[PDB]
Nucleic acid binder design. Structure first.
Ligand SMILES: [K+]
Ligand SMILES: [K+]
Ligand SMILES: [K+]
Ligand SMILES: [K+]
Ligand SMILES: [K+]
Ligand SMILES: [K+]
Ligand SMILES: [K+]
Ligand SMILES: [Mg+2]
Ligand SMILES: [Mg+2]
Ligand SMILES: [Mg+2]
Ligand SMILES: [Mg+2]
Ligand SMILES: [Mg+2]
Ligand SMILES: [Mg+2]
Ligand SMILES: [Mg+2]
Ligand SMILES: [Mg+2]
Ligand SMILES: [Mg+2]
Ligand SMILES: [Mg+2]
Ligand SMILES: [Mg+2]
Ligand SMILES: [Mg+2]
Ligand SMILES: [Mg+2]
Ligand SMILES: [Mg+2]
Ligand SMILES: [Mg+2]
Ligand SMILES: [Mg+2]
Ligand SMILES: [Mg+2]
Ligand SMILES: [Mg+2]
Ligand SMILES: [Mg+2]
Ligand SMILES: [Mg+2]
Ligand SMILES: [Mg+2]
Ligand SMILES: [Mg+2]
Ligand SMILES: [Mg+2]
Ligand SMILES: [Mg+2]
Ligand SMILES: [Mg+2]
Ligand SMILES: [Mg+2]
Ligand SMILES: [Mg+2]
Ligand SMILES: [Mg+2]
Ligand SMILES: [Mg+2]
Ligand SMILES: [Mg+2]
Ligand SMILES: [Mg+2]
Ligand SMILES: [Mg+2]
Ligand SMILES: [Mg+2]
Ligand SMILES: [Mg+2]
Ligand SMILES: [Mg+2]
Ligand SMILES: [Mg+2]
Ligand code: NA
Lengths: 150, 128, 50, 114, 104
RNA sequence: ACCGUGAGGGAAAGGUGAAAAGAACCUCGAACAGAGGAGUGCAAUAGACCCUGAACCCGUCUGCCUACAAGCGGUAGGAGCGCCAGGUGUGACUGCGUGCCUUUUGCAUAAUGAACCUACGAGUUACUGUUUGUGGCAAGGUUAAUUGUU
RNA sequence: UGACCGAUGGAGUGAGGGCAUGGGUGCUAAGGUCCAUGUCCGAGAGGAGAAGAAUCCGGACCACCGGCUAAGGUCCCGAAA
RNA sequence: AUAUCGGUAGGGGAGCAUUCCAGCGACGUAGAAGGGAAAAGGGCGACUUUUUCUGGAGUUUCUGGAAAAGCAAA
């Protein structure tokens, strides 16, 4: 039987407050912007944050190609991967990711600041990265947000 | 009087169940279960055809069991079943007692051989 | 008193020690013998004067 | 006389097997596997009763941080102001107000935001 | 109207007629009137007061419904593997149930 | 019984019911192979292996979950769904977590050990010393073998 | 503080190990080996160091959805600038 | 009142269950023991009570007594 009578309430699928926000990447640093984006996606800015529920915001990033990498990171940061075959290690750069597309670079950075579980694998799908300032997300009425305020 | 009352209740319940049983069939229960799973839920006449033409040995005994279950339905309802009116509503295969034998192996060793048996129960009911 | 309410004097009787009957008793496992050596074996006795 | 405690011996196992219900595979009903699983769970439960307080305090602190950043302050600054002004409302109450009574949380923040 | 007040060293949010469980209060009877005057916050349907040295004049009067409510049993298990050490005890926490009559 | 040329070694295996009243007859089926009835009986889920009828192990039905997911399989949180009025089944998702015994300075150890369940399985008794708890008598204490009356 | 000492009943142990300091030996090698003085593991859980027997902090009667700190920390995984 | 309460080898203290016995109380074909399910309880625990289904003939409380007196691994 329950002798507590004063509990903390967890949010659930029917009680979360999910919103669409738009942030800009005009001159921000890649890691410093992506940490704030990870906090937005996880829902650390909501007073009803619940670590076992998708309670964050759907984030649209515009002007993704204007992001800034300081130092020699654009070609001096060596990402390594493996194909699974002998002699199968490969190298690539943030420049290679940017050439492929800005969404791939942003997804790679944000996955790594997100939790490593099923919930984080679900959360990463709430992020939308676009190269220019033109995107098509009507019927949801996204709200502009100043990322420098956060 | 308690056992008499319980027995009367069970006997009254039995009057509305239409079933037949095959007990101590000297044959692998795992092999009989394939045929049982094949015919579970079928209309009775289609199931009879399937059992008649199946390529498994156990279907010959299952066919006789299903015929007996249909006859029990007819006796307990005091009429005859129309075409396409009955279906196999329940069927299970259970393991029974095992005969144990010994088969000689090389260099003097001896191994056990298990000859298994099974029970089968069939219910029939109307397609309601 | 009578035969149905017999009572010995306080402290006159005492339960015996039983070893090797589990961890809660504090006397299980090695059963007060320690681990190895001659003194832990069945049939050990002391040679008097040795 | 000869004493064998068959019924007591069996009842002791059956009581624990009643508690191992819901486990996976042999761990639910096979006696030497089920008993082994049950005690490890009891050690886990002892540790988890201690770690539960840490987890709930962390949850309260995160919720308070979110509400304070809505109000324009950080958690550390808000707690420093609260302790300087000497109000004794604990983190559980503050987090409950933050999630369910935002006007009361705003009142707390405005009292110490001087 | 709700107040934040502590009862037996734990802060609770309480309204009128609530039926709380609190830590055991010794030497009480059914129907006895208990008093708790250490309110930290008062929220009167819109007007909120916060007390540093508590809220002056605030007060919660309760009546005891059950003087001894025992919680669910908890198994306390200690074990150190490969050492033979093992003990298993039982614990039940003790509460009293009160009903809040007036919230000043 | 079985095993051994032989001397010799050496098992397993009790229980229907008060009373055989131990199931005439009918149905399916080549057949009691088996079953469904009828009948006997307090009871046949007491039907011949028959009192009771546990576990490991094997099935069917019903409820919930499950085909993007990764480690001792639990533990602490926690939506939804489903049953019988505050209890109960399941459990999306989250945190923490390298079984147990023994042996060791030290074992997740790739050191030892166990297929699983039920049953069996290991500080006992006698005598003589000694210490102590409790008692009876007390400058004394106590009988042994044995003998009488019952 | 309280357990120092006497007398008596019951023992177990007599394979140790790491670190720091003073040394011998070795090659001013060894997670080496032999002594001395402390300490910890042994027989000790909890916190930080990604994950570590003895390095840093700290000795677990039980419960609690309360508060303060130690070492070490406060961009995200991960609590706090 | 204050203090204390991590523990291997090991020392000490206090108890539960089992089989049988004496004394005193009881229960049972209007349902004993055993088996299945559910619920409650104990400074703490070994364990103990209650309801119901199966079962169809024995069982049990308190005090004291005696032991073929408790298994997870050989
Ligand atoms: K019978
Ligand atoms: K009988
Ligand atoms: K059975
Ligand atoms: K789990
Ligand atoms: K080996
Ligand atoms: K490191
Ligand atoms: K943080
Ligand atoms: Mg055969
Ligand atoms: Mg054929
Ligand atoms: Mg030959
Ligand atoms: Mg010991
Ligand atoms: Mg042992
Ligand atoms: Mg040994
Ligand atoms: Mg040795
Ligand atoms: Mg020794
Ligand atoms: Mg020998
Ligand atoms: Mg075993
Ligand atoms: Mg024939
Ligand atoms: Mg029966
Ligand atoms: Mg029987
Ligand atoms: Mg994927
Ligand atoms: Mg899926
Ligand atoms: Mg070695
Ligand atoms: Mg280890
Ligand atoms: Mg060996
Ligand atoms: Mg092995
Ligand atoms: Mg092993
Ligand atoms: Mg075994
Ligand atoms: Mg020596
Ligand atoms: Mg030595
Ligand atoms: Mg060395
Ligand atoms: Mg050295
Ligand atoms: Mg040792
Ligand atoms: Mg130590
Ligand atoms: Mg540590
Ligand atoms: Mg602080
Ligand atoms: Mg302590
Ligand atoms: Mg102790
Ligand atoms: Mg009855
Ligand atoms: Mg008896
Ligand atoms: Mg007794
Ligand atoms: Mg024995
Ligand atoms: Mg046993
Ligand atoms: Na003792």
């Amino acid at each position: 039987m329950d002798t507590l009578s004063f509990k903390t309430i967890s949010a659930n699928k029917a009680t979360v407050t999910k919103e669409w926000v738009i942030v800009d990447a005009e001159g921000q640093t890649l890691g410093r912007m992506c940490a704030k984006v990870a906090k937005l996606l996880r829902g650390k800015y909501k007073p009803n944050f619940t670590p076992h529920v998708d309670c964050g915001d759907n984030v649209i990033v515009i002007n993704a190609d204007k992001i800034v990498l300081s130092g020699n990171k654009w070609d001096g940061r060596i990402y390594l991967r493996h194909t699974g075959y002998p002699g199968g290690q490969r190298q690539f750069t943030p420049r290679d990711f940017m050439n492929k597309g800005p969404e791939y670079l942003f997804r790679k950075v944000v996955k790594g600041m997100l939790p490593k579980n099923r919930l984080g694998a679900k959360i990463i799908g709430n992020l939308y990265v676009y190269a220019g300032t033109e995107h098509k997300h009507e019927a949801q009425q996204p709200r502009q947000l100043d990322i420098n305020s956060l | 009087a308690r056992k008499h009352n319980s027995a009367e209740a069970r006997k009254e319940a039995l009057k509305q169940m239409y079933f037949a049983k095959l007990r101590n069939v000297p044959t692998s229960p795992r092999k009989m279960r394939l045929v049982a799973d094949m015919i579970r839920g079928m209309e009775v006449n289609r199931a009879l055809g399937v059992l008649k033409f199946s390529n498994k040995e156990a279907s010959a005994r299952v066919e006789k069991l299903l015929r007996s279950a249909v006859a029990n339905w007819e006796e307990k309802n005091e009429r005859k079943a129309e075409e396409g009116e009955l279906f196999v509503s329940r069927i299970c295969v259970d393991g029974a007692s095992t005969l144990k034998r010994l088969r000689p192996a090389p260099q003097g060793r001896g191994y056990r051989i298990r000859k298994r048996s099974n029970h089968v129960t069939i219910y029939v009911d109307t397609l309601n | 008193m009578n035969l149905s309410s017999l009572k010995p004097a306080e402290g006159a009787v005492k339960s015996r020690k039983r070893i090797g009957r589990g961890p809660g008793s504090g006397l299980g496992g090695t059963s007060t013998r320690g681990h190895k050596g001659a003194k832990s074996r069945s049939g050990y006795s002391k040679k008097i004067g040795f | 006389p000869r004493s064998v405690n068959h019924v007591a011996s069996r009842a002791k196992r059956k009581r624990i097997l009643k508690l191992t219900r819901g486990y996976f595979g042999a761990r639910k009903n096979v006696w030497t596997v089920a008993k082994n699983t049950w005690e490890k769970g009891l050690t886990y439960a002892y540790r988890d009763r201690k770690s539960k307080k840490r987890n709930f305090r962390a949850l309260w602190i995160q919720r308070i941080n979110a509400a304070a950043r809505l109000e324009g302050m950080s958690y550390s600054r808000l707690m420093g102001a609260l302790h300087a002004n000497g109000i004794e409302i604990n983190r559980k109450v503050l987090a409950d107000l933050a999630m369910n009574h935002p006007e009361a949380f705003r009142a707390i923040v405005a009292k110490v935001k001087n | 109207m709700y107040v934040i007040v502590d009862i037996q060293g734990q802060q609770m949010k309480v309204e009128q007629g609530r039926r709380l469980f609190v830590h055991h209060i010794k030497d009480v009877e059914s129907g006895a009137s208990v008093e708790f005057d250490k309110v930290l916050l008062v929220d009167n349907n819109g007007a909120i007061t916060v007390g540093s040295p508590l809220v002056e004049g605030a007060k919660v009067v309760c009546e005891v419904l059950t003087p001894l409510v025992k919680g669910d049993k908890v198994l306390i298990f200690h074990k150190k593997r490969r050492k033979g050490y093992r003990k298993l005890n039982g614990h039940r926490q003790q509460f009293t149930e009160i009903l809040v009559k007036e919230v000043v």
